[PDB]
Structures are given as structure tokens and as C-alpha cells.
């Protein structure tokens, strides 16, 4: 009867849908590879999907996936075994090197633009009409690191204009140079801003941006990458 027809129908629908769904989720990082970068032998039952192209919005070009993958950057990792499936030890400073939990992908070196063509993200000094509206204003707080030592001072907040939201703190180092510090990895406090991933001695190592009114997608990644990795790599300096 209809019921049995409908339900058998549906289990069939659902199966091609998962299949659809799954191949659609194969537009990045495929096909698979061996630890050497050779194409692996077995890609599973699902084919690569027939490719699609994204028209990007401010003359910034085109994107077609699936397409050619390459980590367009050296990887400083030595194998630690004779067989697939083991960790690959860093051969240098995984921080300085950008491997591990400190990894970054070589994104574009343009900035994200709002819908109007202007840079999504700005230092608030150049962000016309913008002001801290609730919550402790960090600007002016000293910055502590996980070693319980001071590392700098906040000398502005880099705001996302269209979503109107603090994304980074800019910090002034002893140096007199500044770094960005992702909003999501600091505790703004009553009198200090505490940074747990980095001990004071590693802040200088936080990567720098070329323009000082501007970050690019590449520099966001290198930075967020850097300070995320400290969680693992600074942890010896990370005093309780």
C-alpha cells in the first residue's frame, strides 16, 4: 500500500542525498595522499564532485573547487617512524616554523572587505564613529603573559566594522613595536589583560603586519596560528 511505497521510496531518496551530500563535502583537501604527498591508492567509494566556480565579489577573481591543492609553504617535519600513521616531529621551532597547533595556511595577502569594498577590519583609531560600548575598555591595560610577566600595553582595538565586534587587540611591546592579539585568546580583566597561550618572551615572536592599518588573510592566519600554538609550545614557561 501507499505507506509501504512511500517509505521504500524515501529510504532511496535518503541514500542518494547522503551521496550527494558526501561528494559535495569532498571539494577541499581531496584527493587523499600519502605522507609523502603521493596520491593515496584508495579514495573510498565516492568520486570527486564535478567542479564549481565561485565568483568573488570585488574583482578579487574566481574560485573553482575541487582544484589543485598545495601547501604553498615549506613544512618542517621529519617522520618519526617507518610506517604510515605516526607523528611527524618538527625539525625546528614549530612556532617559528608554523607547524603543529601553530600551523597557518597560506591564505591570500589581501584583506577581507566588507560588503562595500572597504576593509572588513580596522584599528578603532581609524574606525570613524566607533567606541567601546559595554565591558571593560582594554585600551590602556598592560598585557600579562602565562609566565605572569608583563609584555606590553594595549594601544588600540581593531574592530570589525560590519559586525561591529572587537577582533584583535593591538599591543605595544618594550620594543615600541606592536603586535595584534586575537580577541578570542585573551582575558580582559579589571586592571590587566591576561594572555595565557604566550609567555612574555614570545610576544616579539608574534608575526607582524605589513600595513599598520590593515591585516591580510595571510597575516591573520600566521598570527592566530602563532598564538594558538603557544598553548602547546609555551606550556613549559606557562606558569600556573
Amino acid at each position: 500500500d501507499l505507506a509501504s511505497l512511500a517509505i521504500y521510496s524515501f529510504w532511496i531518496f535518503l541514500a542518494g542525498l547522503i551521496y550527494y551530500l558526501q561528494t559535495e563535502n569532498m571539494r577541499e583537501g581531496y584527493p587523499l595522499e600519502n605522507e609523502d604527498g603521493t596520491p593515496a591508492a584508495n579514495q573510498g567509494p565516492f568520486p570527486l564532485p564535478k567542479p564549481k566556480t565561485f565568483i568573488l565579489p570585488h574583482g578579487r577573481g574566481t574560485l573553482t573547487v575541487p582544484g589543485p591543492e598545495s601547501e604553498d609553504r615549506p613544512i618542517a617535519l621529519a617522520r618519526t617512524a617507518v610506517s604510515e600513521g605516526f607523528p611527524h616531529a618538527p625539525t625546528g621551532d614549530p612556532m617559528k616554523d608554523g607547524v603543529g597547533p601553530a600551523s597557518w595556511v597560506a591564505r591570500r595577502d589581501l584583506p577581507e572587505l566588507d560588503g562595500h569594498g572597504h576593509n572588513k577590519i580596522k584599528p578603532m583609531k581609524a574606525a570613524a564613529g566607533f567606541h567601546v560600548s559595554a565591558g571593560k575598555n582594554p585600551i590602556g591595560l598592560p598585557v600579562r603573559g602565562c609566565d605572569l610577566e608583563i609584555a606590553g600595553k594595549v594601544v588600540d582595538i581593531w574592530v570589525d566594522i560590519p559586525e561591529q565586534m572587537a577582533r584583535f587587540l593591538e599591543v605595544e611591546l618594550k620594543d615600541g613595536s606592536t603586535r595584534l592579539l586575537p580577541m578570542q585568546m585573551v582575558k580582559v580583566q579589571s586592571n590587566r589583560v591576561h594572555v595565557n597561550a604566550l609567555s612574555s618572551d614570545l610576544f616579539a615572536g608574534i608575526p607582524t603586519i605589513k600595513s599598520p592599518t590593515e591585516v591580510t588573510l595571510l597575516e591573520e592566519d600566521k598570527i592566530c596560528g602563532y598564538v594558538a600554538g603557544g598553548l602547546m609550545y609555551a606550556a613549559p614557561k606557562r606558569k600556573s
Partner: protein, 302 residues
């Protein structure tokens, strides 16, 4: 105590955003509203503006027409007595025309006609809002996903109060407007058709509902887990995969063996949820029009 980003810890404000101006008849958009700092702890503080306009207007109008045609009925029950009105608020009920009348539009106003008026108002309210959901996408040159997704919902509602009543031969087979009464109807609808736990669409529908919570839990916690690399900026990450997309995919590949892309995870999403009411609507539609009793059907499936 690492920071979690469930709550913004410093809020920031700027000139009211009046939004992109694609083909939006800008005449129709309202003025910016105030800013809730309350809301601002969680997400955006900008209340408003809103594009109202004929379809917005008609919808919004009848939306109240429906709401009010019910509420007075409640009052008429309460003996116009605001104590009673408050005491008995969930117990009141606007029920459909007695099955005597069936699909008749001639039921006395006091014996079911007040229900039809209310429904007629809801029908127009809901469809016009649907069309509103579409036009808004068109005027910004966006895909029409929100409208499709909205149909799924509309499907089950269509089926509950409209198609199934018609297919059964009477309006009495619909859902009464009332807080406690639509609960009862529901518990009873199951009892009559031999326990919906044996309707395999019902069971399918539960699996998706459970799964929508499953997934939105997975997706949400993941984006927050990688917002330290700007995960929430999903459009640009689609356009240019960041480490955020990569640690996201990777955490999941290493846990359970396969994974999504940033555009991908949102397809899992819209379908995982849209299937709740899509399956749902069916389970109900066959119920009583074609299967009198799901146990008996469960026995020999024909």
C-alpha cells in the same frame, strides 16, 4: 580560566548600519532602532531597521487578525472576566466545525465558524510571509534557500489543518487553537491511529529532530572552538580556506573518520533540519487517510 567566547567581553559600537542596498526598495525599509547592550553580549545590538511593505503589511495585519479572532473567543468564554481569563488561559479553546458540517463553510459562528475565520486569516498570514521570505532574497540577489527551507515547515502545517481535513472529509479533523487543547488533540491523534510510535515517518522525523540538536551542537561548538582563527567568518573561509576550516575538518576526521567542508557542513545542516517536517508531514498525511492503525500496518506492512 581560558576564554570561551560564549559571551563577548568588550562590546564595541559605531554608526547604525543601514545595510546593503542591492535592489531593496529603500523606500520601504524603516529607520534604525535602538541598540540592546543586553543583546550585545550574545550577538548584534542593532535592532532594526526592517523592510515592511505590502506583503509584510498584509501578512502582519492578518497575523493579528488571526491572533485576535482567537483571543476574543477566549474572552467570550472567560465571561469577560479578567480573573477567569487569567485563571483559565490554557484551558480555553477555539475548536473546528463539528463533523456534522464536515468541510462545510456554513457552520454557525459559535459552533466552528469562528475557527474557519481564524484559519483563513492564518492561511493568508503564512503564505504572504512565505512570499516575503522569497522576495527579500531576490532583492539582494541571494539564493532562495530560506524559502525552500520554509516550505518544509509550511508542509506539515498545511497537512495538519488543511490537506488532511479535506482528505478526511471534515474540518473537525483539524487542530483547535488552544494551548492545552492542541496538546490533547495530539495525544489523542496518536491513540486513534494505533500509536504513532509505529508510524515509520514519525520515527524518521524524530531521528532528524534529535539529529538537528546533535548537529547544531556539533557545528556550533566547532565554530566556537576555532573562532580563535576567525571560524565564524564562514563566507571568506569558503572562498579561501583558512586554518580554521582545516582544524575544524581535521578534529572531526580524527574523531569519526570523515568530515565536512565549510560550505558542506551547511548543506548537512539545511537538509538535516528540513527533513524533520518533510518526513513529519508525510507520516501524518497517510495517517487515517490510508493507514487506520500503525500497529496493524506494522504487522503486515500492506
Amino acid at each position: 580560566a581560558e576564554y570561551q567566547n560564549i559571551f563577548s567581553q568588550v562590546q564595541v559600537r559605531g554608526p547604525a548600519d543601514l545595510g546593503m542596498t542591492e535592489d531593496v526598495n529603500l523606500a520601504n525599509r524603516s529607520g534604525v532602532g535602538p541598540f540592546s547592550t543586553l543583546l550585545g553580549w550574545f550577538g548584534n545590538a542593532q535592532l532594526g531597521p526592517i523592510y515592511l511593505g505590502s506583503l509584510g503589511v498584509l501578512s502582519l495585519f492578518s497575523g493579528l487578525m488571526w491572533f485576535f479572532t482567537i483571543g476574543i473567543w477566549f474572552w467570550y468564554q472567560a465571561g469577560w472576566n479578567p480573573a477567569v481569563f487569567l485563571r483559565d488561559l490554557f484551558f480555553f479553546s477555539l475548536e473546528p466545525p463539528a463533523p456534522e458540517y464536515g468541510l462545510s463553510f456554513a457552520a454557525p459562528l459559535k459552533e466552528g465558524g469562528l475557527w474557519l475565520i481564524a484559519s483563513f486569516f492564518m492561511f493568508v498570514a503564512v503564505w504572504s510571509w512565505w512570499g516575503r521570505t522569497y522576495l527579500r532574497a531576490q532583492a539582494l540577489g541571494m539564493g532562495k534557500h530560506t524559502a525552500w527551507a520554509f516550505l518544509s515547515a509550511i508542509w506539515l502545517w498545511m497537512v495538519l489543518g488543511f490537506i488532511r481535513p479535506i482528505l478526511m472529509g471534515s474540518w473537525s479533523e483539524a487542530v483547535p487553537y488552544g494551548i492545552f487543547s492542541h496538546l490533547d488533540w495530539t495525544n489523542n491523534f496518536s491513540l486513534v491511529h494505533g500509536n504513532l510510535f509505529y508510524n515509520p515517518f514519525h520515527g524518521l522525523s524524530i531521528a532528524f529532530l534529535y539529529g538537528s540538536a546533535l548537529l547544531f551542537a556539533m557545528h556550533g561548538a566547532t565554530i566556537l572552538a576555532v573562532s580563535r582563527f576567525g571560524g565564524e567568518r564562514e563566507l571568506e573561509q569558503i572562498a579561501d580556506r583558512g586554518t580554521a576550516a582545516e582544524r575544524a575538518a581535521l578534529f572531526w576526521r580524527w574523531t569519526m573518520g570523515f568530515n565536512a567542508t565549510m560550505e558542506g557542513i551547511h548543506r548537512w545542516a539545511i537538509w538535516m533540519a528540513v527533513l524533520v517536517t518533510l518526513t513529519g508531514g508525510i507520516g501524518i498525511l497517510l495517517s487515517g487517510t490510508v493507514v487506520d492503525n500503525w500497529y496493524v500496518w506494522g504487522q503486515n506492512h500492506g
